[PDB]
């Protein structure tokens, strides 16, 4: 169980926890660091309607929390505020010691409603939810996190707000927020830089809502996106 990777001078070699490796030289406990890596390097999709199909609710299992020391600069970080349709809370409050993920290039903040059926929110493929040096297997409310995993080895800022209707089902609808009466309906293909050009163009050209009601926009299937993320 739980293999310790060995950075040999050539390359990375997994070591057996059953066989005895005499090639290992371990002369500190500073030579043991527990590093956490992000999923978005593996090539998963990153946009919210292609991500929250991998989250579900379930009841009757307690959370578990493990720490990790070093992490990866994230490209996307999420944050949730989901309420039940009667008005109660879905996700549990953050315990003490829980802080947001520290380095985030974009922060998807999502609020809204959904048929919350469960006690917590787990990751359907078995990944963790990385926090401030803490890997957890739930999603605590109101704390900026990423998606990713943890590996053990031997060594030698921009905010985008959303509105979500029907969060837990398969037939969900997301809304991009520009102004608090101005929304744009998402698609599957929207990248964050395209959305940044979108609120620039909307908020500059005066096409926000000039009345009391909401204003929802569609995008024609003619307009490209700005963008392997790292090329």
């Amino acid at each position: 169980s739980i293999p310790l990777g060995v950075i040999h001078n050539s390359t990375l070699q997994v070591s057996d926890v059953d066989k005895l490796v005499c090639r290992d030289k371990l002369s500190s406990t500073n030579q043991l660091r527990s590093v956490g890596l992000n999923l978005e390097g593996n090539g998963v999709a990153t946009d919210v309607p292609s991500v929250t199909k991998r989250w579900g609710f379930r009841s009757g299992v307690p959370p578990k929390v493990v720490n990790y020391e070093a992490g990866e600069w994230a490209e996307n970080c999420y944050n949730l505020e989901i309420k039940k349709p009667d008005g109660s809370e879905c996700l549990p409050a953050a315990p003490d010691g829980i802080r947001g993920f520290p380095r985030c290039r974009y922060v998807h903040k999502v609020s809204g409603t959904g048929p919350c059926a469960g006690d917590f929110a787990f990751h359907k493929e078995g990944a963790f939810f990385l926090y401030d040096r803490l890997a957890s297997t739930v999603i605590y409310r109101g704390t900026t996190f990423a998606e990713g995993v943890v590996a053990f080895l031997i060594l030698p800022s921009t905010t985008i707000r959303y509105q979500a209707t029907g969060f837990g089902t398969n037939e969900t609808e997301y809304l991009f927020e520009v102004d608090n009466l101005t929304y744009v309906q998402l698609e599957s293909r929207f990248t964050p830089q395209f959305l940044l050009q979108l609120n620039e163009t909307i908020y500059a050209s005066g096409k926000r809502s000039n009345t009391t009601g909401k204003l929802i926009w569609k995008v024609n299937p003619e307009i490209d996106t700005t963008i392997a993320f790292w090329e």
Partner: antibody
Amino acid sequence: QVQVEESGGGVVQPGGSLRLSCAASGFMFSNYGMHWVRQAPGKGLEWMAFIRYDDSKKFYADSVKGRFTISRDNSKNTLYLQMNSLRAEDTALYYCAKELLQVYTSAWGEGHSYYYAL
Amino acid sequence: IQMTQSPSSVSASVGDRVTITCRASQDISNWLAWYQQKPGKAPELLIYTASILQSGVSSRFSGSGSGTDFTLTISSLQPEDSATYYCQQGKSFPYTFGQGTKLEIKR
């Protein structure tokens, strides 16, 4: 100007079924959402159903789930309502209602407003 | 998803100023509507979203509020308003609403 008219009423046995025809003219019918609102002749209003403009979602009241089915056709400019398993409390007037929106086409892509009311 | 109005039978004479209190079980944030149902008639929109008077209706009708406690207000009562007034909302889409207030003219 804008005409919204109900049709297809009458009398029916308990446990039966019928269909209403809410025809309308005078506006771009494929771009506006439509409603159904119930009023018993001894009581007030109560909502029944709502369909969007593109027939993407269908929203039903609690006491009418399963039994009642909304549908629309943007060809004949006509709203429909299919009813099954009728009961004695359902004796009422049935209103079909048009909602409010302005159509802001002056962009790269369309979209509209709501201010939800009838 | 519930909504409860002022008492259903309010009586006044011509020229009076009357108010109708409307209470909501959840936070709605200005998604309300006031409908005037004359007898023998289809209802008609007075004020959508608790602020804007609809065209065609005179200025004696007004309304305001914040959150869950809104209030429709008639400035001066006219004899052409023997009707029952409803208080509808549209926030979370079960579209449920109040029971109604019938305003009686003292004749």
